[PDB]
Amino acid sequence: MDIILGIRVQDSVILASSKAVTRGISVLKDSDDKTRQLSPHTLMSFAGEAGDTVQFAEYIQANIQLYSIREDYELSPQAVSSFVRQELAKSIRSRRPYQVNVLIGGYDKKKNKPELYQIDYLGTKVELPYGAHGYSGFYTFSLLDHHYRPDMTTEEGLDLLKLCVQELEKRMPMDFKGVIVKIVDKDGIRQVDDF
Amino acid sequence: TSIMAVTFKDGVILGADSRTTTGAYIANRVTDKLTRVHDKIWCCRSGSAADTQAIADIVQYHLELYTSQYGTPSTETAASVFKELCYENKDNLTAGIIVAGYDDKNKGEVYTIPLGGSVHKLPYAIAGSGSTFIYGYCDKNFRENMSKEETVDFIKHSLSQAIKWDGSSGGVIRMVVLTAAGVERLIFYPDEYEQL
Amino acid sequence: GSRRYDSRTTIFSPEGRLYQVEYALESISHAGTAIGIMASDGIVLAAERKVTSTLLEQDTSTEKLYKLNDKIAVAVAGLTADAEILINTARIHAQNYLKTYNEDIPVEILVRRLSDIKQGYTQHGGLRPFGVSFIYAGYDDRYGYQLYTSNPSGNYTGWKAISVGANTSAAQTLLQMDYKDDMKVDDAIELALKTLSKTTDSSALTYDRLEFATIRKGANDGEVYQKIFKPQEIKDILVKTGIT
Amino acid sequence: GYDRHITIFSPEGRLYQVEYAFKATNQTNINSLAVRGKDCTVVISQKKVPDKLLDPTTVSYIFCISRTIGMVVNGPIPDARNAALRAKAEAAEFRYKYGYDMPCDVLAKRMANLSQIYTQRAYMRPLGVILTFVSVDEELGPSIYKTDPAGYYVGYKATATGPKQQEITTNLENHFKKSKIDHINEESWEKVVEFAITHMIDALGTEFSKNDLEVGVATKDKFFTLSAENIEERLVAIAEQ
Amino acid sequence: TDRYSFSLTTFSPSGKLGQIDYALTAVKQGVTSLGIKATNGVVIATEKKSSSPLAMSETLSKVSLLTPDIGAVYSGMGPDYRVLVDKSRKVAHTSYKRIYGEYPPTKLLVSEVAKIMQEATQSGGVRPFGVSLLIAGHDEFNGFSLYQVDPSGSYFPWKATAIGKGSVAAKTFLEKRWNDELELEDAIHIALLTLKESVEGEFNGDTIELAIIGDENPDLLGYTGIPTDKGPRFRKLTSQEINDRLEAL
Amino acid sequence: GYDLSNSVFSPDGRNFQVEYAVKAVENGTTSIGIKCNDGVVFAVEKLITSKLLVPQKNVKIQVVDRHIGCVYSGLIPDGRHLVNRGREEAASFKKLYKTPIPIPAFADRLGQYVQAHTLYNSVRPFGVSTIFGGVDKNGAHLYMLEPSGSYWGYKGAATGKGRQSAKAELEKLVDHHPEGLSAREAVKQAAKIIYLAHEDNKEKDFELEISWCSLSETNGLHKFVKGDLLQEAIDFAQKEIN
Amino acid sequence: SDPSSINGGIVVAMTGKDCVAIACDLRLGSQSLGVSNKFEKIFHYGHVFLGITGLATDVTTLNEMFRYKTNLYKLKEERAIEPETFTQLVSSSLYERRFGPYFVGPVVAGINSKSGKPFIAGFDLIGCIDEAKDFIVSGTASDQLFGMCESLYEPNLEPEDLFETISQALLNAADRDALSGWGAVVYIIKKDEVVKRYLKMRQD
Amino acid sequence: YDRALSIFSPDGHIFQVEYALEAVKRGTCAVGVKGKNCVVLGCERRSTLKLQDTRITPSKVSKIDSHVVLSFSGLNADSRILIEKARVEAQSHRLTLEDPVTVEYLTRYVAGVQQRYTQSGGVRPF
Amino acid sequence: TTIVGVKFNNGVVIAADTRSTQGPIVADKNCAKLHRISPKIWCAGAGTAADTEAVTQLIGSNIELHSLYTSREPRVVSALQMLKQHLFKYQGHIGAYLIVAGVDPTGSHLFSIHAHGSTDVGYYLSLGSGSLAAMAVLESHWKQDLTKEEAIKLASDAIQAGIWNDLGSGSNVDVCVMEIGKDAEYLRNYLTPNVREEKQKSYKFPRGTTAVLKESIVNICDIQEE
Numbered sequence A: 001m002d003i004i005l006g007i008r009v010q011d012s013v014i015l016a017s018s019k020a021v022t023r024g025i026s027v028l029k030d031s032d033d034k035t036r037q038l039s040p041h042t043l044m045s046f047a048g049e050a051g052d053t054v055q056f057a058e059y060i061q062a063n064i065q066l067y068s069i070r071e072d073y074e075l076s077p078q079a080v081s082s083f084v085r086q087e088l089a090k091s092i093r094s095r096r097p098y099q100v101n102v103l104i105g106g107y108d109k110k111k112n113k114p115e116l117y118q119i120d121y122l123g124t125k126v127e128l129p130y131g132a133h134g135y136s137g138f139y140t141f142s143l144l145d146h147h148y149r150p151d152m153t154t155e156e157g158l159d160l161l162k163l164c165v166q167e168l169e170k171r172m173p174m175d176f177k178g179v180i181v182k183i184v185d186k187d188g189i190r191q192v193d194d195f
Numbered sequence B: 001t002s003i004m005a006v007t008f009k010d011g012v013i014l015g016a017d018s019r020t021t022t023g024a025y026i027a028n029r030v031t032d033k034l035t036r037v038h039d040k041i042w043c044c045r046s047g048s049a050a051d052t053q054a055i056a057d058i059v060q061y062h063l064e065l066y067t068s069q070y071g072t073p074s075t076e077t078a079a080s081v082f083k084e085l086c087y088e089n090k091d092n093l094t095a096g097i098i099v100a101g102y103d104d105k106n107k108g109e110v111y112t113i114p115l116g117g118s119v120h121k122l123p124y125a126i127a128g129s130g131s132t133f134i135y136g137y138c139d140k141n142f143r144e145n146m147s148k149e150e151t152v153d154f155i156k157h158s159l160s161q162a163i164k165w166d167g168s169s170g171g172v173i174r175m176v177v178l179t180a181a182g183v184e185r186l187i188f189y190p191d192e193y194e195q196l
Numbered sequence C: 001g002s003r004r005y006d007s008r009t010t011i012f013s014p015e016g017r018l019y020q021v022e023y024a025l026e027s028i029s030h031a032g033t034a035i036g037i038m039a040s041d042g043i044v045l046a047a048e049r050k051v052t053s054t055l056l057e058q059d060t061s062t063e064k065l066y067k068l069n070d071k072i073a074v075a076v077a078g079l080t081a082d083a084e085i086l087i088n089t090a091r092i093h094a095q096n097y098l099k100t101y102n103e104d105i106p107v108e109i110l111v112r113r114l115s116d117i118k119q120g121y122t123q124h125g126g127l128r129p130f131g132v133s134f135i136y137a138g139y140d141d142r143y144g145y146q147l148y149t150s151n152p153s154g155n156y157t158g159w160k161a162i163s164v165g166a167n168t169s170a171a172q173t174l175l176q177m178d179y180k181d182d183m184k185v186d187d188a189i190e191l192a193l194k195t196l197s198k199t200t201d202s203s204a205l206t207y208d209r210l211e212f213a214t215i216r217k218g219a220n221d222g223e224v225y226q227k228i229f230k231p232q233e234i235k236d237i238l239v240k241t242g243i244t
Numbered sequence D: 001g002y003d004r005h006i007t008i009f010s011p012e013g014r015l016y017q018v019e020y021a022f023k024a025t026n027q028t029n030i031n032s033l034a035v036r037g038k039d040c041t042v043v044i045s046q047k048k049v050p051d052k053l054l055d056p057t058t059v060s061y062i063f064c065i066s067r068t069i070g071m072v073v074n075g076p077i078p079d080a081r082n083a084a085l086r087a088k089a090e091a092a093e094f095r096y097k098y099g100y101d102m103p104c105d106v107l108a109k110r111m112a113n114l115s116q117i118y119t120q121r122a123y124m125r126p127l128g129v130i131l132t133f134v135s136v137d138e139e140l141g142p143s144i145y146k147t148d149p150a151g152y153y154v155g156y157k158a159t160a161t162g163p164k165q166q167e168i169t170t171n172l173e174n175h176f177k178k179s180k181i182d183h184i185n186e187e188s189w190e191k192v193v194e195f196a197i198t199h200m201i202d203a204l205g206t207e208f209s210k211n212d213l214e215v216g217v218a219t220k221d222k223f224f225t226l227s228a229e230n231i232e233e234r235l236v237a238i239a240e241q
Numbered sequence E: 001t002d003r004y005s006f007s008l009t010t011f012s013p014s015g016k017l018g019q020i021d022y023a024l025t026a027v028k029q030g031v032t033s034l035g036i037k038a039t040n041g042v043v044i045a046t047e048k049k050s051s052s053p054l055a056m057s058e059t060l061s062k063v064s065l066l067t068p069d070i071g072a073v074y075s076g077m078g079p080d081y082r083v084l085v086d087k088s089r090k091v092a093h094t095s096y097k098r099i100y101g102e103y104p105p106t107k108l109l110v111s112e113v114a115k116i117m118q119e120a121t122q123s124g125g126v127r128p129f130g131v132s133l134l135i136a137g138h139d140e141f142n143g144f145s146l147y148q149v150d151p152s153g154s155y156f157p158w159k160a161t162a163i164g165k166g167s168v169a170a171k172t173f174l175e176k177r178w179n180d181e182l183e184l185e186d187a188i189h190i191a192l193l194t195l196k197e198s199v200e201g202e203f204n205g206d207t208i209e210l211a212i213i214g215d216e217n218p219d220l221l222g223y224t225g226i227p228t229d230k231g232p233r234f235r236k237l238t239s240q241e242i243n244d245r246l247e248a249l
Numbered sequence F: 001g002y003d004l005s006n007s008v009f010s011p012d013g014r015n016f017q018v019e020y021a022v023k024a025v026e027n028g029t030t031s032i033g034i035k036c037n038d039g040v041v042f043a044v045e046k047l048i049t050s051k052l053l054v055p056q057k058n059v060k061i062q063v064v065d066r067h068i069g070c071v072y073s074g075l076i077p078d079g080r081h082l083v084n085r086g087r088e089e090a091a092s093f094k095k096l097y098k099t100p101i102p103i104p105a106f107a108d109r110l111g112q113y114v115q116a117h118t119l120y121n122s123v124r125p126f127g128v129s130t131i132f133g134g135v136d137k138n139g140a141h142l143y144m145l146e147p148s149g150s151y152w153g154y155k156g157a158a159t160g161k162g163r164q165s166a167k168a169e170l171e172k173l174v175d176h177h178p179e180g181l182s183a184r185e186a187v188k189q190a191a192k193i194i195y196l197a198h199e200d201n202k203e204k205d206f207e208l209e210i211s212w213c214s215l216s217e218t219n220g221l222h223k224f225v226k227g228d229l230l231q232e233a234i235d236f237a238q239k240e241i242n
Numbered sequence G: 001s002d003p004s005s006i007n008g009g010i011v012v013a014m015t016g017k018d019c020v021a022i023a024c025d026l027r028l029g030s031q032s033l034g035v036s037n038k039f040e041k042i043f044h045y046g047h048v049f050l051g052i053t054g055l056a057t058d059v060t061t062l063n064e065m066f067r068y069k070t071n072l073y074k075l076k077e078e079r080a081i082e083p084e085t086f087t088q089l090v091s092s093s094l095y096e097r098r099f100g101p102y103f104v105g106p107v108v109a110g111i112n113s114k115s116g117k118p119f120i121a122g123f124d125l126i127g128c129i130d131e132a133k134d135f136i137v138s139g140t141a142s143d144q145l146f147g148m149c150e151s152l153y154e155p156n157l158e159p160e161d162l163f164e165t166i167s168q169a170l171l172n173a174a175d176r177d178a179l180s181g182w183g184a185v186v187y188i189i190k191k192d193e194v195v196k197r198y199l200k201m202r203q204d
Numbered sequence H: 001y002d003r004a005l006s007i008f009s010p011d012g013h014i015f016q017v018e019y020a021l022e023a024v025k026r027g028t029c030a031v032g033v034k035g036k037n038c039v040v041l042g043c044e045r046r047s048t049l050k051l052q053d054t055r056i057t058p059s060k061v062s063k064i065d066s067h068v069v070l071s072f073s074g075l076n077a078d079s080r081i082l083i084e085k086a087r088v089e090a091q092s093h094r095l096t097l098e099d100p101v102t103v104e105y106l107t108r109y110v111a112g113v114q115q116r117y118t119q120s121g122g123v124r125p126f
Numbered sequence I: 001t002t003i004v005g006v007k008f009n010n011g012v013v014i015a016a017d018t019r020s021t022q023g024p025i026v027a028d029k030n031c032a033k034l035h036r037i038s039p040k041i042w043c044a045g046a047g048t049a050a051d052t053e054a055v056t057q058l059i060g061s062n063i064e065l066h067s068l069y070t071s072r073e074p075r076v077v078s079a080l081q082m083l084k085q086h087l088f089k090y091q092g093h094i095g096a097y098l099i100v101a102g103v104d105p106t107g108s109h110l111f112s113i114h115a116h117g118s119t120d121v122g123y124y125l126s127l128g129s130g131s132l133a134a135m136a137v138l139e140s141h142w143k144q145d146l147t148k149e150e151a152i153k154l155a156s157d158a159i160q161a162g163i164w165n166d167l168g169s170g171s172n173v174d175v176c177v178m179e180i181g182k183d184a185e186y187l188r189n190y191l192t193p194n195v196r197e198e199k200q201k202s203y204k205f206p207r208g209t210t211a212v213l214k215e216s217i218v219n220i221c222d223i224q225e226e
Helices: A052-070 A077-093 A136-147 A154-171 B049-067 B075-087 B131-141 B148-165 B190-195 C019-028 C080-101 C107-123 C168-178 C185-197 C231-240 D016-022 D077-098 D104-118 D165-179 D189-204 D228-237 E018-025 E078-094 E106-118 E167-177 E184-195 E239-246 F016-025 F076-097 F103-116 F163-176 F186-196 F227-240 G003-007 G056-077 G083-095 G142-152 G159-175 H015-025 H076-096 H103-119 I049-070 I076-088 I131-141 I148-163
Strands: A004-008 A013-018 A021-023 A026-029 A035-039 A042-048 A100-107 A114-120 A124-127 A130-132 A179-185 A188-192 B002-007 B011-017 B020-022 B025-028 B034-038 B041-046 B096-103 B107-113 B124-128 B173-179 B183-188 C034-038 C042-048 C066-069 C072-078 C132-140 C144-151 C155-158 C161-164 C210-216 C225-229 D032-036 D041-046 D062-064 D070-074 D130-136 D142-147 D153-155 D158-161 D213-219 D222-226 E033-038 E041-047 E063-067 E070-076 E131-139 E143-149 E155-158 E160-163 E208-213 E234-236 F031-035 F039-048 F061-064 F068-074 F128-136 F139-145 F151-153 F156-159 F205-214 F222-225 G010-015 G020-025 G028-030 G033-036 G042-045 G048-054 G104-112 G117-124 G127-131 G135-139 G184-189 G194-199 H030-034 H039-043 H061-065 H068-071 I002-007 I011-017 I020-022 I025-028 I034-036 I042-047 I096-102 I109-113 I119-121 I124-128 I173-179 I184-191 I212-217
Touching: A004 A042, A004 A100, A004 A114, A004 A136, A004 A154, A013 A042, A013 A100, A013 A114, A013 A154, A035 A052, A042 A052, A042 A077, A042 A179, A052 A077, A052 A100, A052 H076, A077 A100, A077 A114, A077 A124, A077 C080, A077 G056, A100 A179, A114 A130, A124 G056, A130 A136, A136 A154, A154 A179, B002 B041, B002 B096, B002 B107, B002 B131, B002 B148, B011 B041, B011 B096, B011 B148, B025 I119, B034 B049, B034 B173, B041 B049, B041 B075, B041 B124, B041 B173, B049 B075, B049 D077, B049 I076, B075 B096, B075 B107, B075 F076, B096 B124, B096 B173, B107 B124, B124 B131, B131 B148, B148 B173, B148 B190, C019 C072, C034 C072, C034 C132, C034 C144, C034 C168, C034 C185, C042 C072, C042 C132, C042 C144, C042 C185, C066 C080, C066 G056, C072 C080, C072 C210, C080 C107, C080 C132, C080 E106, C080 G056, C107 C132, C107 C144, C107 C155, C107 H076, C132 C161, C132 C210, C144 C161, C155 H076, C161 C168, C168 C185, C185 C210, C185 C231, C210 C231, C225 C231, D032 D070, D032 D130, D032 D142, D032 D165, D032 D189, D041 D070, D041 D130, D041 D142, D041 D189, D062 D222, D070 D077, D070 D213, D077 D104, D077 F103, D077 I076, D104 D130, D104 D142, D104 D153, D104 E078, D104 I049, D130 D158, D130 D213, D142 D158, D158 D165, D165 D189, D189 D213, D189 D228, D213 D228, D222 D228, E033 E070, E033 E131, E033 E143, E033 E167, E033 E184, E041 E063, E041 E070, E041 E131, E041 E143, E041 E184, E063 E078, E063 E208, E063 E234, E070 E078, E070 E208, E070 E234, E078 E106, E078 E131, E078 I049, E106 E131, E106 E143, E106 E155, E106 G056, E131 E160, E131 E208, E143 E160, E160 E167, E167 E184, E184 E208, E184 E239, E208 E239, F016 F068, F016 F128, F031 F068, F031 F128, F031 F139, F031 F163, F031 F186, F039 F068, F039 F128, F039 F139, F039 F186, F061 F076, F068 F076, F068 F205, F076 F103, F076 F128, F103 F128, F103 F139, F103 F151, F128 F156, F128 F205, F139 F156, F156 F163, F163 F186, F186 F205, F186 F227, F205 F227, F222 F227, G003 G028, G003 G048, G003 G056, G010 G048, G010 G104, G010 G117, G010 G142, G010 G159, G020 G048, G020 G104, G020 G117, G020 G159, G028 G033, G028 G056, G042 G056, G048 G056, G048 G083, G048 G135, G056 G083, G056 G104, G083 G104, G083 G117, G083 G127, G083 I049, G104 G135, G104 G184, G117 G135, G127 I025, G127 I049, G135 G142, G142 G159, G142 I025, G159 G184, G159 G194, H039 H068, H061 H076, H068 H076, H068 H103, H076 H103, I002 I042, I002 I096, I002 I109, I002 I131, I002 I148, I011 I042, I011 I096, I011 I148, I034 I049, I042 I049, I042 I124, I049 I076, I049 I096, I076 I096, I076 I109, I096 I124, I096 I173, I109 I124, I124 I131, I131 I148, I148 I173, I148 I184
Parallel strands: B011 B107
Antiparallel strands: A004 A013, A004 A130, A013 A179, A021 A026, A035 A042, A042 A100, A100 A114, A114 A124, A179 A188, B002 B011, B002 B124, B011 B173, B020 B025, B034 B041, B041 B096, B096 B107, B173 B183, C034 C042, C034 C161, C042 C210, C066 C072, C072 C132, C132 C144, C144 C155, C210 C225, D032 D041, D032 D158, D041 D213, D062 D070, D070 D130, D130 D142, D142 D153, D213 D222, E033 E041, E033 E160, E041 E208, E063 E070, E070 E131, E131 E143, E143 E155, E208 E234, F031 F039, F031 F156, F039 F205, F061 F068, F068 F128, F128 F139, F139 F151, F205 F222, G010 G020, G010 G135, G020 G184, G042 G048, G048 G104, G104 G117, G117 G127, G184 G194, G194 I212, H030 H039, H061 H068, I002 I011, I002 I124, I011 I173, I020 I025, I034 I042, I042 I096, I096 I109, I109 I119, I173 I184
16 A cells, blocks of 8 residues: 565566555545656656656656657666656746655666665755665664665575565555565666565 | 814814833833924824824825925825825824814814715814813813914813823824914923813 | 838748848858867867957857857857847756756757757747857767767768857868878877968967867876866966967 | 848948937927026927917927926827837836936936937837936936937037027037036026026027927925916026126 | 847958947047056046036046945046946945945946946847046955956956046056056056146146045045944045145155 | 838938828818816818718717817828727826826827827827817817827817818917807807818808807816807808808 | 754754864654664865754755856856855845744855855854854754863864864764764865765764 | 748749758668558658767657658757647547547648648748 | 933944844854944944844945935935935834934934834934833933034943943943044944853863764865866
C-alpha cells in the first residue's frame, strides 16, 4: 500500500514495489505496478497518496525521456533525481503539493557503479546504500545495516530482500499482496517473481 | 478621543483632543486630530490612527489636483471624496471623520462620516469614543446660530465632559476657528478646562 | 501610421534568402579575426582585436574573450554590443542547467539555445538578428573537447579548426595545410599565432592587440583549467614561438 | 526618407522633427518677459484678443500649476493644456510621496524628461510649447526655470520668449550689467511689475493696455494673478514714476 | 493600435548598423569633454555653454554624480543625457545596493548602462541616446578606471580619452602629456590646457566645469564616528577652486 | 511631404490633417451659441433634404448631464462619439465629487480627449466643433471647442457654412446690448440670425430648432424650445427679414 | 512541528585570528529516524563557507540558489565574492519570500582575503544580520552551543587551538541533541590552505 | 506586433510561400524510398569540407520518436525549431493518451506549425 | 531594543542599544541597530530586526535618488512618508518600528512610526520594548529647550532604565547626535554599563583532547594549476 524498498549492491540496484492498491475502504487491486521505467537502466519507483503518484510519475517519464532520446545520452541517476527533486521542492510552495516519495535506482554508465537515491516527498535527495520510505521502511532499516556489506552481489541482496519482506508480513498492520521485484542491472531492467 | 464640530453664526469651529492611545499605554499625548486637507476646510480624525491619516493624504492629494484645475472646493466636495473611498474599503478599514469647512456662500458646515461610507450633514456632530457620553449635554446646551464667545465655551465644556468620562481622551483641548476672517488656532491647557 | 514606416524588414527574397542575415554577414566581416583550433588536449582560442591604440587600455580588456561557464568560454567576432546580450543569456542558461540537473551543461546544448534566439528574431517581431559569430571552446565528459561556430542566422556547425570574422578564407586555407590530429595545445598555440601573422588586420601583429585563452586538461586530476592569458604572458609566448 | 517625418537620427545627427516644434511656438506671436525681484518673480505676457465675440477674461496663458508656482505658456493652447494637466498631476504626486510640494527646479526637469520621451517615441508627437515656470521657493529664492519642447531646461536670472524676445534681452542685459547682480533690487513686488511693463514698452515699441497684459506674480509662499483692474493701477503708476 | 516592434536600428547591405552611425554624428556636434586617468585620482572636465547671457551656468550641470565614488560626463545631446543620468543612478541601486548593499564597481556600472543603450537600439519606437559618456570612477577591487560608453551599446576602458567635437585634437594633446606615473594635480593642469583649445568663448572657472574622482573627503561623508566608511571620492570643484587651477597653469 | 499623418510636422507650424478636418466642420450645418445674462440659447439650422423626412424627430442637440446643452457640426457619427464620451466624463465627476460638472471643468476634460488623437498616428483626429454651455455655480458660460483641442470663452460663436452671416449679426447683438441681454429675448434673436444664415443655404430649405439652458426660464436645466414660443420666434424672424 | 525543527541539526562557527573555522554534523533525518550520515551541511563558494540549518527542502533549494548567484559574481567581476557581500546577498534573497518565509538559519563564515580579516555572521528566517566576531551559533540546539561557546572561547586563537575549541563545542552539543550525533566535519579554514577534518563522534 | 509579413497577392498566392519553396530547392537533397519491410531516408551531407568533425556537427536525419524519423531540406536554422516542437508533442501523446504518436499525427502536426504563420500577420512561414 | 529621541533646540539626539535578542535567547552581545536613511537622517530600528533593516535599505535607495534629483539634502518628512505608504499596503504585516530623527536646512525634527502606519509628533518620542521604562526618567528632569550637553546625558540615562527594568534592552548605549551646521556624531559605546567578568581558567587543551577520524586537504584557494 506504501511499500517501496531499495537495496543498492555493487553491481545493481534492487527495487521492490507494492502490488496492492487500496482506494477507499477496500482493496481494488491485488496485482498492480507502482513503478515505471524512465530510461533503459534508470527505474523510478513511486508511492504516496492516491493519484499524485499516477499523474506525476508519467509527468516525469515524459521529461526524462524527452531529453534522453533527443540528445541520445542516458542521464546519470545523479542528473535524474535532481530533476525530480526540483519539481518536488517547487510544489510544496505552490498550490498543489505532490504527495509522492520516490526511489530512483539507476545504473550509472559514466561510473559503471549502481546508485540509489531516496527523495522524500519534500524534495531532498540523498544517496544511500539502501533505502526506504513510509512507516513500513522503519521496520526494514534495522535488517539492512546488519546484513549489508560493501561486497554484495545481486544474489546476496535478493536473499536479504526475502528477510525484509517476511518481516513486513508480521509487523505491518496491513498487507501489500507481495511485491514486484525489479533488478536494475547493467544489461537492462529485469523483473523476477521472487519475494 | 472626542471630537466634535458645531456650526455657528459666523462660521464653524472644529474641536479635538490630541491623546492617541495604543492599549493602556498612551502612545503620544500631543498627536493632533485636526488635519488640514484644504486650507479653509479641515477635518477631524478618530478611530484607528493609521487608517484615517492614510486616507486623509489621498483625499488631500485629489483636492490639490481639484483646486489647481477647477478652482477652490466647497465643503461638500471634500467630504464626498472621503465618503466614496470609505465605501470601497469598509470591510477593510474603519474611520470616524467630521469634515467641516468655511465657504463664503453657505458659511460653516459640518458633515460626519461613519465607517460604512455614509455622509450626513448636521448642525453639530460628535465622534470618538467619548461622543456617546456628551451626546446628552450637546443637544441640551447647543443653541442654533449663537455668537463666537458662546461657541468657544460650549466646545470647551463639552470636551471637559468628554475627558472626565473617557480616559482615552485628554492631553489638551485644541480648536480651529474657520471663519470669514481666517484661521485662528486655539489650545487650552488642562488647568483651564478642569475648573470650567 | 505604424505600417507606414515599416518596410517588412525580415522576409525572404525570390531566392529564398533573408535580407537581414545577408546584410549581417557583411558586418561580421568588418570585425576582426578570431580563430579556434581544437587540439587533442585542449582548445586554443586566439583573437586579434578590431581596435588598437596607444591610449586604449587593452591590459584589462577581455572584449572578445568571455567565460559563459567554468568549462565553456567564447571568442567574439562581430558587434561587441550585440554579443553582450547573448553572453549574459548563455550565463543564465548554463547556470539554469546546473540548478536543475546538478550537472555541467554540455557544449551542444548551450550553443543550440543561443541559435534558437537568432532564428526567432527573423521569424517574428520584425527584429534584427544578432550580427555576431562566436567560436565556442568547451569541454564536456561525453564528447570531450568540442569546437563550434555559430552564424547570425542561428545555425551551428562543428569543426576541428575554423575561423570567423575578417580573413576567414585566408586563415582557413593555412589551417588545412598545417592541421594534424596529433597536435597538442603547445603546437596549436604556435599555429594560431603564425596564422594571425599572415591574416593580420593592419601591418603588425602585437601582444597588446592579441587576446589569447586556452582550456587545458593539463590541470591535475583530469580537471580543466581555463586560462585567459594577460598581454604580458602573451608577450612571453610571442618570443617563445618566435613571432618576435 | 523618414529622417524628418519621425524622430530618428539623420546623417547630420540632428532631429528635424524636433526642430519643427520650435518653429510653431513663435507663430502664436505671444511675447513674455520674466524678471526676478528681490522677494518676488514677476511675469507679464501678451494677451492680444482682436475680437468682440471672444471673452478676453477666458483668453489666458498663465496657469497655476501649484499654489506657489505659476506657469506661462508661449505657443499653441492645445499643447499648453496637456502640459499643464501633466504638470499639475506630478506636483500633487510629489506632495503625496515626499511630503512636500514639488520644487520649480524639479517640476521643470520632470516635464523636460517627458519631452525627451515624446521625441524618443516615433509615433508620439512632442508638445510644442515653451513653458516658463516662475516661483519663489524657500531653498532657491525667486526662481525662473524655462523648459522647451526638446527637453532642455536651465535656470535664469531673467528670460523672455516670443518672436521679438531679442529686443527684451537688450533691456534686461543693461539692467543686470549696471546693477551687477542677478536680480532687481526692489523690495516691493508692485514696483517690479511697473518696471517689467516699462521694459516691455521699450523693447517692442508697443503701448500696452490692461487687456493686452496679463500679469502673474509669485511672492513668497503664494502665487496670484492681477485682474485687469489691478493691472490698470500699474499702468497709471507708470505715469507716477 | 501599435505595431512598432520592427527595429529602427537594422543592418545596411554594406554592413554596420545605420542608426547608431547617425547618432555618433550628434556626439561630434556636441560639447567637448575629456578625462585623464592619474595614478592617484581621475579628472574629468567639460565646458559649460549657454544660449543666453541671462542663463545661469550654476544651474547647469554636465558632470553629475551617479554614486559617491563614480561620476559621469557626456558629450552629445542635452536632453538625452538628462533622462539617462536618472536611469543610471536607478539601476545602480536596484542591481547592487539592494542586493549587495553597496555602490557598484565601476566595471559593473558601465556594463549595465551599456545594456540600456543596447535595448534602445532594439525594437521599434526607440532610437538610441545620442551621447557618449565618460564614466570615471573608483572601486576597491581594481582601483581607478576610466571608461568610454559608446552609443553602440559597447564600452572601452582607456588610459586617457576625449569625446565631443574637439576629441581628435584633444587626444593627440593627451598622448604626449600622459605618462606611466602622473599626479592628479598635473592631470588637472593638462585637462584645462587641452580644453582651452576646445573652448571658443570664456575660459573662467565659472564656465569650465571640473570634477575629480580623486580621494575621499570625510567632510562630505555627512557623519563621523564611523572610521570604516570613507567619504565621497568624487568631488565637484566650485568655480573659485577651478580659478586657482587656472592660475596653476 | 509632411501631410501623411498628424505627427509629421513642418517648419511652417502646420498640421495638416487637423486643418483638413476643419473643412468638414465648415461644410457642416449652421449652429450658433449666444451668451446671455441668465444662460445660453443654442440654435441650429436643420436642413430639410426631402419631404419624406419626419420633422423635429432628428436632433443634433444632445443633453449632457441635465444642464449642459451640446450641439455640434461636421461629421455627425464623430460628434456623437465625442458627446458620448463627455456624458461619461459628466457621470465620473458626479460620482467622485458629487456635483453636476461645472462648465469650465467640462471643457478641460474634452480638450484633453481631442488632444490625444492629434498626438498619435494610430488613431485618427476628430473633425467636429461642438458648442456647449449652460448654467452652473460659477454663472452661465459658453464654450466652443475646435477639433484642434482649443477652446475659449465666447460672447457669441458660430460654425458651419453660414458662420459669416451669423457672426456679423452677433457683433451687432453685442452692440445692441453691451450690458448683455435676456435669455428670453435671445430666443427671437437666435431665430433671426439662423434665418439670415440660411441665405447661404437658400438653395435649400430648413427647420428651425432652438434649445436653451437658462436660470430665468428653465431653472438651470437644459430643455428644448417648442410649441407657441418656437412659432413666435419663427414669426419674429420672418418679419425682420421681410 | 515547525518546519525548522523537524529536520534540525546544528552549525557552529568561530573566528580564530588569521583563520576561521565552521563545523556541522552530518545527521539529517525526518522525525526521529536518522536517514543519512552522507549529507554534510557545509558548502563553499571561492573562500566563503556556508553552513545552513533547518528545513531540509529549503537547505537544498538555497544551496543551488546561492551557487547560482555566486557563479554570476565570479564570471562578471573576474574576482571572488567577499564574505561581507555574500552576507547582504544571503539576507536579500531570504527576504524576497517574505510571505511563505524560508525556514532556515544560514551562517556565513569566511575570511576577507584583502585584509586577511576573519568574518562570521548569522541569520534566522527572513533576515537579520547578526554581527559577532567570536562565534555564531545556529540550529535547534542553538542553546546548547551558546552556553559552550562563550565559556570556552578566548579572544584570538591560532588555527591549531581553534580546532580544539570549535570541535569541543560541537562535540558536547551534538550528543545532547537528538537530531545530531551521526558524523561531523570541521573545516579549518586558513587563507593559504583549507584542511577538512572528519571527527569521530559517539553514537547518539 | 501583427504587421503582415504574409499578405494575399493579386495572383491568388502569398509571395513568401513561393519564395519558401525556392529556399527548399537550394537545400540539400533528401530521398525517401520505402520497401515492404523498411523505410529508408538517405540524405546529402555537406561534409566535403575539411577541418570538420562530423561527430559534433548536426545530422540531416533526427529521430523524433522511437519509430518516427524526420529528414529535412531548406534552412538548417528553421528546421531545428520544427524538430523541437515535434518531440515535445510526441511525449504529450504518451502522457495523456498513451502510446507513441503515429507517423500521420506528426505529419499533420508539423503541417499545422507551417499553417499558423501562413495565415497570421507579423510572422513569415518557414 | 528601545529608541529614545530627544528634540531640542540645537539638534536632535537619537539613542538605542546593541543587545540582539532572538526570543529569550540573546543572540548577540553587540550588534548595532542604528541605521542611516540618509547621512543626516539617522533612524534606529526596534521590533523585528529584519523588518527595520530591510526597509531602511530599500527607502535608503529611494531617498538617495530623490536627493540626486533635487541636488540638495533630503527632508526628514520625506522619509516618513515613504515608510507610511509602504507599511499601509501590506496592512501592517511588516513589523518596522522606527523613530526617524534628522537635521536638514529646514531644521530639527523628530517623528515616530508604528507598524500599522501610524505617525506621531513630539518633542520626546520613545518606542520599542523599553519605551515604558525610558519615558519615566525623562518626564521629571526634562524642561523644553536644552543643550546637547544636557540632552546626551538625559537620553542615555533613560536607555539605562530600559536595561535594568526590561530585558529586551541591554548592553552598550550607542548615540548619534545630529547637530545643525555640523556632521552627525555617531558616539558608539558612550556608556558601557556592564561587561563580562573575567573567569579564573582557560580551557585550552593539547591536541588529541578532540577525537579525529581522518583528515584530508580540500582546496578552493586555487582553481587548479597545470
